Amino acid sequence: LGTRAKESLDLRAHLKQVKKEDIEKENREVGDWRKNIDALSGMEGRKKKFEG
Amino acid sequence: LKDAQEKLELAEKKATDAEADVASLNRRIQLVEEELDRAQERLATALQKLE
Incomplete structure (x- = not known):
């Protein structure tokens, strides 16, 4: 057994x-992964070029 | 010129009205900035609770 x-x-x-x-x-x-935030800091561009 | 005088007065009044909307848009900008900050904070706490 x-x-x-x-x-x-x-x-x-x-x-x-x-x-x-x-x-x-x-x-x-x-x-x-990170998935970071912007906190209204990545607003540094105009409507000049959009295709690239 | 008299008509040019009235036109310039009306255009300056239009400028001032655009400035009143400038004030209102400033208020929108400020309150929406408060919203942005509050959303950053609330999203942080939600992700923490997720953890």
Whole structure:
């Protein structure tokens, strides 16, 4: 009984390792970028050129 | 000239009316600047609550 139980335990151990430890390879992607504001400072242009 | 006199008077009156609208547009500019600042602040707090 112990042998059969430990067989399944060891079999699932490696699967759990691969599933979980490999998550630590990267988890910062949740972090978003700046997305800064202007605060009425980027108003320094007239209606001179618009195509470029 | 008399008609040129009336025209210049009317044009200067039009200038003054444009200046009254200049005042009203100044008021719009100021209040909308308050709105801009308030929106910056409220957006900051909303994003923080999101975090």
